[PDB]
């Protein structure tokens, strides 16, 4: 797992490209995949 | 100014763009 640089991120099968820095949202513990206004995958829990 | 007041970079991340004015306030 690599961070802080553009990769074609492919997490849990789901994909996309961007620069992945950190996280703060603290999914309601059960929760897995984050979303925003356009839902646009605004987070992911690296599940490695 | 203070009365009339209002994400932005988020919708930017969809193709949005808000070009800045040529006449900034101070000049106006
Ligand atoms: C070699 C190995 O098993 N590596 C990780 C392990 O450290 C981790 O606990 C698990 C789920 O968190 O995923 C896997």
Residue B8: strand pairing partners: none
Is residue A41 within 8 Å of residue A35, measured between CB atoms? yes
Contact A40 B11 (CB under 8 A): no
Residue tagged 């209002």 (tokens): B6
- What is the token pair recorded at A45? 């829990």
- What is the spatial distance between Cα A35 and Cα A26, in angstroms, rounded to a whole number? 13
- What is the token pair recorded at A32? 């897995």
- What is the spatial distance between Cα B13 and Cα A15, in angstroms, rounded to a whole number? 17
Helix and strand numbers (H, E) in chain A are 0, 2
Is residue A13 within 8 Å of residue A44, measured between CB atoms? no
- What is the spatial distance between Cα B21 and Cα B26, in angstroms, rounded to a whole number? 12
> What residues contact B1, with CB distance under 8 A and at least 6 apart?
none
Contact A37 B7 (CB under 8 A): yes
Contact A40 B7 (CB under 8 A): no
Q: Residues 22..41 of A with a Cβ closer than 8 Å to B: which? A: 36-38, 40
Can you list the pairs that A12-16 forms with residues at least 24 positions away whose Cβ atoms lie under 8 Å?
A12/A44, A12/A47, A14/A41, A14/A44, A16/A41
């Amino acid at each position: 797992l690599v961070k802080n640089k553009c990769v074609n991120f492919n997490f849990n099968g789901l994909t996309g490209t961007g620069v992945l820095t950190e996280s703060n949202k603290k999914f309601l513990p059960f929760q897995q995949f984050g979303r925003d206004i356009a839902d646009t995958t605004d987070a992911v829990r690296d599940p490695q | 100014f203070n009365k009339v007041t209002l994400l932005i970079c988020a919708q930017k991340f969809n193709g949005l763009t808000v070009l800045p004015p040529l006449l900034t306030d101070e000049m106006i």
